[PDB]
């Protein structure tokens, strides 16, 4: 039983990606202090305990599922598509999410507001003519006050429906006060859609749409995500635990039940001695 760890994560042979102050979802959405993570790829995304959010206060229904599938995809490669939003103002921003010196927003999301004094029923489409899945991350804005709702979106209650040939997903934004987070009582709700090859995406919204700017190229592979504060190191190891890399020469380990790579099996025993000699009968 391998019961001790070196305390550091070996950066080979696995493509480790240390996420400094960024969670996977924050790097996905395009949080300003996560701009260095654009188009990154990883075999293991190491997510530090010190990570924090510093943008518009959002919320991900089924957060675990999105984090899991993004981690499994193993890439943040974002392809910008040409979406045509007619009759609305694009590139909305806020002072809660300060990019540069001025107001900003998530870099992978487009905050569409009314243009002039109208907000048409957006109805856009994108076909998936490529042979890979596309991941679209969109949002719904929940304003704090009805005045804000009508000031941003002329409708008194918008809705957002994102649909494909096989599935559809509709959100009715609500207006209500919420706990004060970074100076705002309004929220973003983050939803995702996967467009399989040969399928179509239709976005139909009459208000409260945080539209996508493109798609994340989905992949299949040996990628995952780990929560660990262990520091990365220049060394070779096939088995990574939150406690660092451990040698996989022994068949069992007692370090952590969370593992990645060619790891030993986790057992509850701290020691198991295998006899490699004969009965020991000493003199006298």
């Amino acid at each position: 039983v391998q019961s001790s760890s070196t305390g550091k994560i070996c950066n080979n042979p696995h493509r480790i990606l240390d996420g400094i102050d960024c969670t996977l979802i924050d790097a996905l959405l395009g949080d300003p202090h996560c701009d260095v993570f654009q188009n990154e790829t990883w075999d293991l995304f190491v997510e530090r305990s010190k990570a924090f959010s510093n943008c518009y206060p959002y919320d991900v229904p089924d957060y675990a599922s999105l984090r899991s599938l993004v981690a499994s995809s193993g890439t943040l490669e974002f392809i910008t598509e040409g979406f045509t939003w007619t009759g609305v103002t694009q590139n909305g921003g806020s002072n809660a999410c300060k990019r540069g010196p001025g107001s900003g927003f998530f870099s992978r999301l487009n905050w569409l507001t009314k243009s002039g004094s109208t907000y048409p029923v957006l109805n856009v489409t994108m076909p998936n003519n490529d042979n890979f899945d596309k991941l679209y991350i969109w949002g719904v804005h929940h304003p704090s006050t009805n005045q804000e709702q009508t000031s941003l979106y002329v409708q008194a209650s918008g809705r957002v429906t994102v649909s494909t040939r096989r599935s559809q997903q509709t959100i009715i934004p609500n207006i209500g006060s919420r706990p004060w987070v970074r100076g705002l009582s309004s929220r973003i709700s983050i939803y995702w859609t996967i467009v399989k090859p040969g399928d179509v995406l239709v976005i139909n919204s009459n208000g409260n749409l945080i539209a996508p700017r493109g798609y994340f190229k989905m992949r299949t592979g040996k990628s995952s995500i780990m929560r660990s504060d262990a520091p990365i190191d220049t060394c070779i190891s096939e088995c990574i635990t939150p406690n660092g890399s451990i040698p996989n020469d022994k068949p069992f380990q007692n370090v952590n039940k969370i593992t990645y790579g060619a790891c030993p099996k986790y057992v509850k025993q701290n020691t198991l001695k295998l006899a490699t000699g004969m009965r020991n009968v000493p003199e006298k």
Partner: antibody
Amino acid sequence: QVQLVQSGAEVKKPGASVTVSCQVSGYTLTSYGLSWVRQAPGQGLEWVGWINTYDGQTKYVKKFQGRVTMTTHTGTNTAYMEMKSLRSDDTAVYYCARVEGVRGVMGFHYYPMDVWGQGTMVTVSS
Amino acid sequence: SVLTQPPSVSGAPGQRVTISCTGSSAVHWYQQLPGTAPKLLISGNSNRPSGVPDRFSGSKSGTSASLAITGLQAEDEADYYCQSSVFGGGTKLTVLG
């Protein structure tokens, strides 16, 4: 802005117990571990102990084992260090310093104390 | 582990000061200005944190790390500690006219 704000100066009597507090601001207490470091007046820094916020496991020096207790009140982003059976030699300035690792590793092995509090002058003597 | 350190280097403004530490086993260098909480000056024996001038530097060779301050100003005079848990003895940097 990240800030650690400590209690006021305490004047105690030998044999008593004292409780120093450290209120964190600008970050979440459970994101970082917290070390406690004493400095006798003009005798250099001395590592007292370490609290692992988010799971509560401690590590004190053998010199302080049994007579120092560290806790975290996560509701108020506060950490407390109480020293029981105060001696005269315990007159010192106590600092709470922020250390990085809390998950997978004990932070103070691999990370520095990048943010310090102003320290409280616990004087047990006269 | 035991840390050792060369104490009380008296230097003039504008010069270079070298402070040593010999870890017997991650060393970090802290500065305590007079009447102020200690400050992190370098981590990882080489890395400098945010906010410190580039004149501070660190160098690890084997089991002996050293901290170099170049063109030191008035605010650099303080007491310097190495840390690895255990601290160093301390090294006072005075000003010399």
